[PDB]
UniProtKB/TrEMBL annotation:
InterPro entries: AB_hydrolase_fold, Pept_S9A_N, Peptidase_S9_cat, Peptidase_S9A, Serine_Peptidase_S9A. Residues 462-674 form the Peptidase S9 prolyl oligopeptidase catalytic domain. Belongs to the peptidase S9A family. This is Oligopeptidase B. The keyword Protease applies. The keyword Hydrolase applies. GO terms for biological process: proteolysis. Keywords: Hydrolase, Protease, Serine protease. The lineage of its organism: Bacteria, Pseudomonadati, Pseudomonadota, Gammaproteobacteria, Enterobacterales. Residues 5-404 form the Peptidase S9A N-terminal domain. One of its GO terms (molecular function) is serine-type endopeptidase activity.
Length: 677
């Protein structure tokens, strides 16, 4: 019916290694975001998306309403104790933001407000609480707040005794700060006013002019993120320096005045380590001897002195640890499962935390105090809503502290399976899927196949209440644990990045083909979704295997890969040479160009597709998906739906603009449900 927008073509040649690529839409990039022709094209496509999806308004309403009616209005966090006070977070209906309260641990009846997000947001356009921590003496509250939506945080201090605010503000910070043990001094991280990269650590005396703050440390390499931590012992504040590949920690004595940074272990390429300090020892998680990491104990910094507690193992990835009075507890991955193990400091007794679910995730939750036998850990499966447990590490007593509440939900209505697919190279790829039992008939059901598959991030199988809107309409929902993710440890990550990145896209296709072959879904109604680096996935897969999918949602997709990775002026490019590679090298130019979705768009039939992006703020810059859609409209040979939806907004809402997140999910789900009908 309707004529889609047609972007003007302006042939823009880019020549590298004597290869000339001609980019007809280079001009959709305006770093200033004011070119009126660039805004006209984005607004035109939004108007086309509006007009094309107008008939789905009723369905979007039904979806929105049933998603919001699943979740409670009142949320109360599980209370935790820290330094003799009990803390709870509270959301009332009508209140846009959290209220943070506390009481003395020995107290039940009365709670004091620490901070009311609604009060703090009064007469502001935007509010996000980035951080909240009371000093060790329980007398002062430090808060990191963002009033301007650019994740530059202001730090302010409140005297809890008389609820009065101090006069000063620490400006343009990462929101990362730590109290010295004097409850008078804080360390905090200043962003580079230009790059916005966290680069400087300062010491501040609370009450005083931030002019008098002392520069403690400045990071020289802008691939190294600067973070602050405080050891379980409270003896050290950690300056945590990391690239994607490489760590370095500096120690600040948290007890004494005029501390300067003390090197732990100098940075060495491809050595990642993190430390804690407890019971007069350093504990270190390090890949020095093995990609899957080991855990070491040491009296001092010197790497030569580190004693092996847990050796690196090819079949077990060591993800993190917590330290308690009598136990070490570690989070690991093995055979495609997250796992928790406990080891007694004295007896060396080992226990495994057991579950009975094919598709679940477990993790260490918040454990602020080490002098206890009570471990808090989280659990979620494709069929069991997210649960906090408290485990007695000595007695094995396991009590539920909180369950995610889901209305109109009967858990036994759904089934889940773990499936292993032999990929085209003989490698075994795990898959997690879930469906409604009473509407399942082999070879009949639409499939929704979700992937990410970059940075070693895992799509761990867990519960989603919004997913019930697809399951209750006959969909089989699949997580494809493709290479480039972390589900089978560091090797699974490395086998889907740099000169192996193609395995990511091949795994997604291999999984989809197998699931259809084995009768999990209807071959004519296979859908897929992926966002950001998962949008790169969507883009490569439709160029390579266009006929496999009926319809796609590609959120904020990374698709202009070669051109973006050739340009250091784009934020992220300098940090990502260790992910995709550096196309200033001909080997990486050729390898990346082979899959770069914008470059590999051809005159062939594509699936129906909804593409999303955002003008004002960017992980992926808005222009990549805009150029992608313009080029697809120019070359694609089919007559299927292609829509571009650009968020024009100023910024977000109550933390994650929850209203609006559900509206976006409803629009994407109506689009897929309309195609599956």
């Amino acid at each position: 019916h309707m004529t889609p927008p047609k972007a003007e073509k302006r042939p823009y040649p880019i020549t590298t290694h004597g290869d000339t690529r001609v980019d007809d839409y280079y001009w959709l990039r305006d770093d200033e975001r004011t070119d009126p022709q660039v805004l006209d094209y984005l607004q035109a496509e939004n108007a086309f998306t509006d007009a094309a999806l107008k008939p789905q308004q009723a369905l979007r309403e039904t979806l929105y309403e049933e998603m919001v009616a699943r979740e409670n209005l009142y949320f109360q966090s599980v209370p935790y104790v820290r330094h003799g006070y009990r803390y709870q977070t509270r959301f009332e209906p009508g209140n846009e933001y959290a209220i943070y309260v506390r009481q003395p641990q020995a107290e039940s009846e009365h709670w004091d407000t620490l901070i009311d997000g609604n009060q703090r947001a009064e007469q502001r356009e935007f509010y996000t609480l980035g951080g909240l921590e009371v000093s060790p003496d329980n007398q002062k509250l430090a808060v990191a707040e963002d009033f301007l939506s650019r994740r530059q945080y202001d730090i302010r201090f409140k005297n809890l005794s008389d609820d009065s605010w101090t006069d000063e503000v620490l400006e343009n910070t990462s929101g990362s700060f730590e109290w010295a043990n004097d409850s008078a001094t804080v360390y905090y991280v200043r962003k580079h006013a230009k790059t916005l990269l966290p680069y400087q650590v300062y010491r501040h005396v609370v009450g005083t002019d931030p002019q008098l703050d002392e520069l403690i440390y400045e990071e020289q390499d802008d691939t190294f993120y600067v973070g602050l931590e405080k050891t379980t012992s409270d003896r050290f504040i950690l300056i945590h320096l990391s690239s994607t590949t490489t760590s370095e920690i500096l120690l600040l004595d948290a007890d004494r005045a005029d501390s300067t940074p003390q090197m732990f272990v100098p940075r060495r390429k491809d050595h990642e380590y993190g430390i804690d300090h407890y019971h007069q020892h350093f504990y270190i998680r390090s890949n020095k001897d093995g990609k899957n990491f080991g855990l070491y104990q040491s009296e001092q910094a010197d790497e030569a002195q580190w004693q092996t507690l847990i050796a690196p193992r090819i079949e077990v990835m060591l993800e993190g640890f917590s330290l308690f009075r009598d136990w070490l507890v570690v989070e690991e991955r093995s055979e495609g499962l997250t796992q928790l193990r406990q080891i007694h400091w004295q007896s060396g007794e080992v226990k495994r935390i057991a579950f009975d679910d094919p598709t679940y995730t477990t993790w260490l939750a918040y454990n602020p105090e080490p002098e206890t036998e009570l471990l808090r850990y989280g659990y979620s499966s494709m069929t069991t809503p997210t649960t906090l447990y408290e485990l007695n590490l000595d007695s094995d007593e396991r009590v539920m502290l909180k369950q995610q509440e889901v209305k109109n939900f009967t858990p036994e209505n759904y089934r889940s399976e773990r499936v292993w697919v032999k990929a085209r190279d003989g490698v075994e790829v795990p898959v997690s899927l879930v469906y409604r039992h009473d509407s399942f008939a082999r070879g009949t059901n639409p499939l929704m196949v979700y992937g990410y598959g970059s940075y070693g991030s895992s799509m761990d199988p867990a519960f989603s209440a919004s997913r019930l809107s697809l399951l209750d309409r006959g969909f089989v929902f699949v997580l494809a644990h493709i290479r480039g993710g972390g589900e089978l440890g560091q090797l699974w990550y490395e086998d889907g990045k740099l000169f192996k990145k193609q395995n990511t896209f091949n795994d997604f296709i291999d999984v989809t083909e197998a699931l259809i072959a084995q009768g999990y879904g209807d071959a004519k109604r296979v859908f897929a979704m992926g966002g950001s680096a998962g949008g790169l996935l969507m883009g490569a897969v439709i160029n390579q295997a266009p006929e496999l999918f009926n319809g796609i949602v590609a959120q904020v997709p990374f698709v202009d890969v070669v051109t973006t990775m050739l340009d250091e002026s784009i934020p992220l490019t300098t940090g990502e040479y260790d992910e995709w590679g550096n196309p200033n090298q001909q080997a990486y130019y050729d390898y990346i160009l082979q899959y770069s979705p914008y470059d590999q768009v051809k005159a062939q039939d594509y699936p129906h597709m909804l593409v999303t992006t955002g003008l004002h703020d960017s992980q992926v810059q808005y222009w990549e998906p805009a150029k992608w859609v313009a080029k697809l409209r120019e070359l694609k040979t089919d007559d299927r739906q292609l829509l571009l939806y650009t968020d024009m907004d100023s910024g977000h809402g109550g933390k994650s603009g929850r209203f609006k997140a559900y509206e976006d999910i409803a629009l994407e789900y109506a689009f897929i449900l309309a195609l599956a009908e």
